[PDB]
Subunit: 302 residues, 4 copies
Amino acid sequence: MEFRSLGRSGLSVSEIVYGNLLTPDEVVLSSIRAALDAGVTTFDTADVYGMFRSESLLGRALAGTPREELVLCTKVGMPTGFGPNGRGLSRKHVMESVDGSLRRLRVDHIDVYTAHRYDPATPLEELMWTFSDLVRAGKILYVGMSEWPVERIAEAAGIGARLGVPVICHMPRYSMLWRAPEAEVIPACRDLGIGQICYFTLEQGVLTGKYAPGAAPLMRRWLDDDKVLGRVERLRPLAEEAGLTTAQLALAWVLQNPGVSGAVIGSFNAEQVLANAESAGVRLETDLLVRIDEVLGDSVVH
Amino acid sequence: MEFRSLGRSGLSVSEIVYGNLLTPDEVVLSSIRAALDAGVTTFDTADVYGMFRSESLLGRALAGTPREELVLCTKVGMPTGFGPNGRGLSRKHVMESVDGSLRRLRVDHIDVYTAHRYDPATPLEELMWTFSDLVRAGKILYVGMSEWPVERIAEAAGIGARLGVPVICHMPRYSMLWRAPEAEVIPACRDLGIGQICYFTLEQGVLTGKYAPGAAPLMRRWLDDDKVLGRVERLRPLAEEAGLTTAQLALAWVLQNPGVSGAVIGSFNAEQVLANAESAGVRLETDLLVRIDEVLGDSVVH
Amino acid sequence: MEFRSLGRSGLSVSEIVYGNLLTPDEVVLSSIRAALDAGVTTFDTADVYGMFRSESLLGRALAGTPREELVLCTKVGMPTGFGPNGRGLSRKHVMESVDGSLRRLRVDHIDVYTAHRYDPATPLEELMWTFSDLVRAGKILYVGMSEWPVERIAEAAGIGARLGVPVICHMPRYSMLWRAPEAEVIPACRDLGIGQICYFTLEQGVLTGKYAPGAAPLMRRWLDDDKVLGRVERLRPLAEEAGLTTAQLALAWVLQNPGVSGAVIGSFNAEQVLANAESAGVRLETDLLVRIDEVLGDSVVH
Amino acid sequence: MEFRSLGRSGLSVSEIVYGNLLTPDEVVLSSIRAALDAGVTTFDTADVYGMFRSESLLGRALAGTPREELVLCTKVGMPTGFGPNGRGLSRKHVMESVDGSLRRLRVDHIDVYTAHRYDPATPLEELMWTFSDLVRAGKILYVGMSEWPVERIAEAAGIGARLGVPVICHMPRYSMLWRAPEAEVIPACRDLGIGQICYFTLEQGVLTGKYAPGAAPLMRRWLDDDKVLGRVERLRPLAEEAGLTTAQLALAWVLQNPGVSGAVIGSFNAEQVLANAESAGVRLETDLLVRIDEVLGDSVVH
């Protein structure tokens, strides 16, 4: 496995991150085991994933692994309770969420606590002072944000610096096909000392090259493009030339960005987890990157 | 039920708040149950109400309700012990009050801790640093004030902003008849990101229209006005035209103010609680508001 | 009993403070009981008094009294352990002292924690950040100083204001005979919002009028003055004219200073404690104060 | 024993510090006992020394000694776990290291927690806010650094002052032969209120005078100097003239620097510990210091 700093911080994450997004218990547990076996250190989940089930299964699967060998990331913000305080980023919801996450993960601290979507109803002073109280308490170490507006990332990072809350992580959608964060988000985050942990790097199967024309919700939207699956198939020669699968090429491609700390995989197939983990440390030649862009053409979203 | 932000905060309160101000245990418990059944989320009490009895009964009645579904507000400042440190807003009295309130309410945090009347003997730096220590400790989330001078509200809000203490709530007397807070208090609070949770909205029965001329202490003072009960009776046609009781019109009237987060009801009649709760989300036409003012005339206190 | 604010704070102390300075256990316990019976709320001790014995006896005697009715003051700084970290005001000694004081006093917080003598070896930033940590932790509420240089009082008060540590109390030697603090200490403390709790108000028996010429250490130094005991005897007519004992006149005299919050008594005679407590609320006429100064003449230390 | 302030702080350390650097358990335990018997108060160790064994043995040997009589120093930064978060000075590694050190040392606080080597991967804001959280929590009292660049010492001291983290200790290599820290490190530390606790004062046996030409790693490098052992032998007359062993002269020499708080000894011979401890309080005449420099000549590293 290869490792990167998560932004401007002393924290190191595995270049491949296992994200058990929610399937029977045994399939999830065996997939997490496969990730550990492959040298993955960094595990991502959320309170909302399988409504607490993802956190509980990660807690069980990681039990016994020395705490210093694991980077545990979870989230708060999506609805996990009834009524208007059962969601969002208020001091109330964040304070009522953290102890449940700690108990289900079977730990006394979370490495990276991520604000799941920006909450326009919560003043950033209210949220960042709540994070300050949890860092002072030793319940969370570092703060992340998921799919936030760039201006709110910068505001949060500023307040965090003032309050001694490390703001080190952003979790975008980023793949060979989905490049929206390259314009403003990744540049701003690099300026602010924030690293990306990338979601949907295999675009829910589209970038595996396993699916032929005429053979999730993201995959649904991709199928509005009548050329994308045919274009991914044409990557296989490019991948094989570099001694990679199409999936390994997709994961390696995301890791070529110096703003990226890690790429998330979520496969429930033990063999795919081990193969996808070997994407770490792979350098792609510039000529390979040029003809990837030529093959995918106007299927790429900028 | 309808919900509002409590000032500039991520906290949402029910537009109707149940305030069990202090009657046998069973009447109080059944009234709180009626409020829960009506979709009321936000409950107000104080250490001093029935000398600890109100907090203990709210703790019992709300037991089993998921914590994230409830907004629990209590108070400190009125006398609950003997001698000059048994009252007021000193670090000593506030620190010696909070654990009793938590134990009686059966919770590990209070959503809104309200300073019950301004204490000229306590420096606001002393009080606001005490609130800071309780927010850091996770014992209180948000701070309120009850019937404070506007200048002390602004001072408290300033210090709170500096110390990361959310100051989000003021509890005035506010009704169709008692409009004193409109002049300075509500305008200043809106400027400071503070929402009103309104007390005596039914003026201890005067604004129910149930009481005829010649048929609590506030009701005592109202009866010095030889026209007020007759004027409230003349609202019934206006209420019925809008498909409301006089009590529902009174509660709806307070909620028409954009500075108001919630209106407190305290009825011990299960049927009245359910009826009064349906005041939430009711919009009053401007013409209705004009002739309310015409009917009540010089009985209104500005 | 009469009460005063302890400096610019919300804390109220009894004008008569019981200080069990160190005699058999039973004499100490019965004297504390006598003070409680007389309406004394405010008790002073120190780790060093009878090497932990004073704190343990106060803890036992005050057991059962509601916490809100008591103001418990203790001290740190004098030697209570072996070696150079067994004394002074270092973070180490203060942090290793506080839990012992809490356990012996049988409380979870000390109202007033007093720095017993200024420690030139400890930076005031080091001491005041230690006090900050104990206030944040809820182990101490308010900070005092005993016989400090005026410049270090002002420095401590400044840092305290910045860190949200209430600095409200100074404990001088102050009596009808010992007036050294009037020149600079009391004026500066009044400016800084600090109240005096006065020690040696009866000058170890000299100001009781019980001791005749030819009939601790402070009393030793007083006997170098060949006129002081004769001069105190001549106060008895002045005292009796005002319906006071000489001891009550001495205690009342200290309380005439607007900079004084409280006067400490330490008598082991139950009858004297009850009599001395009645000094509270006594106003002395200006003509009485003038002829006190005439009677004592050059025995007074300025 | 003689004592010094550890930098600008209220903490006093013994001029001789026992450092059980890692031999059977019994030899280590008896050596620590010998140090206690000699009046040594100040004990240094590290998580990494004998991989947790040094801390566990110090915890056992010091059990029963009153806490106020001991200054316990340990370290974090060197590898104690697998993978890239099992070492360095990240919030993660520091937070995951401190409770192990407390449990093995059998204490609820460490007097001096030393950052073992500068970590270029961790922002000093991240490290110093972690130290702030541990000082607030009462788990560590004072902060040290070991063999840091002078510019990072100054940066850390600045942030520490702002956050109320006492930065009081630097642990250089310093001996009669190794004088590198005299140029910049000791001068800067004296300016910043930091005292030295000196390692390798006997240069792993070279400065004992026990080893003849032709009779570890530091001793290995010294033997590249074909004159150093012969030059140390020529100190014996100088030592004997002052009533010292060569080892006592070496330890006394380090203590002549006003920037030095303490000199570390690590001997496993009970007799050597007691003899070396008597180096404390020894003043060396200027003429003695001049001819030491003449005897050692170009063997000294500046």
